[PDB]
């Protein structure tokens, strides 16, 4: 997994946002960033990769109305159930960019 | 917090990724995406927001060479220590975009 660096150049971190420029699979070069705020966690002073089971345990995601996200997710009993969450609660538009806050 | 849909339009969800076109503070629009895999999680079938603490308990982050992220983070005793994590562990280039796997 990961390894992004081998095919990216000119990466910068600022605050918690990583930005880098990376080879498109065939052809061009894209510059993109990802906010680490949500992939990294501090545990008693050490940076740890923070896990989430969303993708792994949920399915059929779809946007309802303007902000609601819907999916079906495995209950601890391995059963799929319906479920939704209002993306409006914490996804904000910060000067044109969607941001988790 | 949040309320992106008040000032964004033409939104979509593909897998766990959300895309939308949002108003810059004053001026035009920008179309960004945000990967929701590390932003919410599935608890016994119900979706919830995944909190984190990187932003609120570490400070002065820095890029170290190719892929190494460095910072100072707070410990269970309440003191800051240096700490690093190799971003190459789980940050991959996916066809020009940075993704967390
Ligand atoms: C310089 C000069 O010459 N000025 C002259 C003035 O006479 C006059 O000034 C104003 O210009 C503004 C600029 O556009 C006018 O339009 C807009 O309004 C606001 C202004 O932001 C300021 O207030 C923000 C807080 O607002 C809270 O309270 C007010 C009512 O009192 C309401 O709007 C809300 O209910 C809101 O409540 C929320 O906030 C509390 C905190 O107390 C929080 O606990 C709760 O969550 C609660 O829900 C404040 O946040 C903001 O900070 C900015 O100010 C400075 C920079 O100047 C920095 O310190 C900050 O970092 C930041 O830049 C101001 O103090 C503002 O909302 C508008 O900008 C938004 O929209 C853009 C897209 O269109 C987007 O790009 C921005 O990033 C921002 O987007 C956010 O909001 C939209 C919905 O509006 C949402 O869909 C997005 O997801 C995004 O979400 C965040 O938005 C707010 C905070 O920004 C939060 O509510 C959300 O939870 C979330 O965090 C824009 O500036 C303004 O009306 C006008 N005069 C006024 C207002 O009296 C101008 C005329 O324009 O003329 C000059 O001559
Ligand atoms: O160990 C890395 C981790 O993720 C790997 O997937 C990413 C991969 O990037 C892809 C890579 O493949 C290109 C295509 O196959 C193309 O058809 O062939 C060329 C060879 O000439 C490949 O470059 O490279 C492109 C551009 O460089 C990239 O856009 C693709 O997504 O490998 C890079 C290496 O840094 C990494 O960022 C990603 O991991 C995955 O394959 C696997 O090794 C791991 O799960
Ligand atoms: Mg997370």
Curated annotation (Swiss-Prot), chains A, B:
Its name, as the record gives it, is Cyanovirin-N
Q: What does this protein do?
A: Mannose-binding lectin.
Organism of this sequence: Nostoc ellipsosporum
Q: How is it modified after translation?
A: Cleavage, or reduction and alkylation of the disulfide bonds results in the loss of anti-HIV activity.
Provide the family line: Belongs to the cyanovirin-N family.
- Describe, as the record does, how this protein assembles with itself and its partners: In solution exists as a metastable domain-swapped homodimer which very slowly converts into a more stable monomeric form at room temperature. Under physiological conditions it is unlikely that the dimeric species exists and indeed the monomer is more active against HIV. Interacts with HIV-1 gp120.
Pfam families given for it? CVNH
Can you list the disulfide-bonded cysteine pairs? 8-22, 58-73
For molecular function, the Gene Ontology terms on record are: carbohydrate binding
Q: What are its applications? A: Overexpression of this protein to provide quantities adequate for medical use as a topical microbiocide has been attempted in a number of systems including E.coli, Lactobacillus jensenii, the yeast Pichia pastoris and Nicotiana tabacum; see PubMed:20162270 for a review.
Span of the secretion signal?
Answer: none
Instruction: Please share what else the UniProt entry notes about this protein.
Output: Its activity in situ is unknown, however it acts as a viral entry inhibitor, inhibiting HIV-1, HIV-2 and simian immunodeficiency virus (and some other viruses such as feline immunodeficiency virus, measles virus and human herpesvirus) infection and replication. It prevents essential interactions between the envelope glycoprotein and target cell receptors by binding to carbohydrates on viral protein gp120 and possibly by other mechanisms as well. Addition to cells must occur before or shortly after virus addition.
| InterPro entries cross-referenced by the UniProt entry | Cyanovirin-N, Cyanovirin-N_sf
Can you supply a Gene Ontology BP term from the record?
A: regulation of defense response to virus
Membrane recorded as keyword: no
**Superkingdom of source:** Bacteria
Q: Which keywords, in A-to-Z order, does the entry hold?
A: Antiviral protein, Disulfide bond, Lectin
């Amino acid at each position: 997994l990961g390894k992004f660096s081998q095919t990216c150049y000119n990466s910068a971190i600022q605050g918690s946002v990583l930005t880098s420029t990376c080879e498109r699979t065939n052809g061009g070069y894209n510059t993109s960033s990802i906010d680490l705020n949500s992939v990294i966690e501090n545990v008693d002073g050490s940076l740890k990769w923070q896990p989430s089971n969303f993708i792994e345990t949920c399915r059929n995601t779809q946007l309802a109305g303007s902000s609601e996200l819907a999916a079906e997710c495995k209950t601890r009993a391995q059963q799929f159930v319906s479920t939704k969450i209002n993306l409006d609660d914490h996804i904000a538009n910060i000067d044109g960019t969607l941001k988790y806050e």
